Curated annotation (Swiss-Prot), chain A:
Family: Belongs to the flagella basal body rod proteins family.
Residue stretches in coiled coil: none
Protein's name in the database: Flagellar hook protein FlgE
UniProt-annotated location(s): Bacterial flagellum basal body
Superkingdom classification of source: Bacteria
Swiss-Prot record, chain C:
Domain of life, per lineage: Bacteria
Lineage, opening ranks: Bacteria, Pseudomonadati, Pseudomonadota, Gammaproteobacteria, Enterobacterales
Localization: Bacterial flagellum basal body
Name listed for the protein in its UniProt record: Flagellar hook protein FlgE
Family: Belongs to the flagella basal body rod proteins family.
Gene: flgE
Transmembrane portions of the chain: none
Length: 50, 202, 51, 50
């Protein structure tokens, strides 16, 4: 901002799956979770499994 | 893998092997086969019970000029050693071990804790060490050490060892090895398969 | 508090002829202080030797 | 073991009694360094007199 002010509008989430190769591809370069692929398990890019 | 975090082949049959049981878990060659599963549950910390260090002492070290021991002055103690200790909750204790050379072939070991605001500054002698004619340690190297409670967690009681340490002249005091048996809780990251069939998780 | 080193000193193969000025040409000892392991190496004889 | 060369024409020192810090008390002075069990260095001064 013009007044030397910084604001945060959010953070991008990351999802790690307990099992890959279960994400069925859907048309364009995206994947849809299903059975044998686990829940999204949302996380943060800071530290951990991400 | 699969939804249940099991090692499964491409067609959908679970893989079996020797199950791992115990604390710490270890492989058993005398148990019946069971399916192998990679758990995702976080592991808990284990209190440090046996810590061992190796300190090389100097025979040519003169006795400190200041007769009374002091905790706020470096010249009061000949050697300082920092050791990491883990309690039952996960708190880290930076235990300070002070070596003082009072006379010939005799050493006084003092223990202090820095992470505890209520910890008492050491004044008396906690351990007495005497070496052989050639500087070989003989006895008295195992000490029962208890830290200070913090955050309502019980203090950790363990055995501190200075075995395999010699006072032969090496120029300056040096610590060559330091080990303990405590770890903070971790999180599942990755798994690898060795050539012995064992699965090791980082 | 360390026992003294009780060694044996030898002057074998000594020269008494006039050489102008007396000088030290050979002196050694069999006692060594503990030294740290600088490195290791292998020579052409197949042996592994540490210095 | 050590080797020392003796001067055949070197006269007897004038000061017959032996001293520790007198140059004329002895003909030659040498030092030998030995190590004990604890590793401490011991210096032995060897004095050669006629």
């Amino acid at each position: 901002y013009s007044n030397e002010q910084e604001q945060v509008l959010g953070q991008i989430v990351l999802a790690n799956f307990a099992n890959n190769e279960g994400l069925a591809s859907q048309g364009d370069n995206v994947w849809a979770a299903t059975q044998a692929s686990g829940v999204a398990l949302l996380g943060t890019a800071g530290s951990g499994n991400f | 893998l699969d939804e249940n975090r099991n090692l499964v082949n491409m067609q959908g049959m679970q893989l079996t092997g020797y199950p791992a049981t115990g604390t710490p878990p270890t492989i058993q060659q005398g148990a019946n086969p069971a399916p192998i599963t990679i758990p995702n549950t976080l592991m808990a910390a284990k209190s440090t019970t046996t810590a061992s260090m190796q300190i090389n002492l100097n025979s040519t070290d003169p006795v400190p000029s200041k007769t009374p021991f002091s905790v706020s002055d470096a010249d009061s103690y000949n050697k300082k050693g920092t050791v990491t200790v883990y309690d039952s909750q996960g708190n880290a204790h930076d235990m300070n071990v002070y070596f003082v050379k009072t006379k010939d072939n005799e050493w006084a070991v003092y223990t202090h804790d820095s992470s505890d605001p209520a910890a008492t500054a050491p004044t008396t002698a906690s351990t007495t060490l005497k070496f052989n004619e050639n500087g070989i340690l003989e006895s008295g190297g195992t000490v029962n050490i208890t830290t200070g409670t913090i955050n309502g967690a019980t203090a950790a009681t363990f055995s501190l060892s200075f075995l395999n340490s010699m006072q032969q002249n090496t120029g300056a005091n040096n610590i060559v090895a330091t080990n303990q048996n405590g770890y903070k809780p971790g999180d599942l990251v990755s798994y690898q398969i060795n050539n012995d069939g064992t699965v090791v998780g980082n």
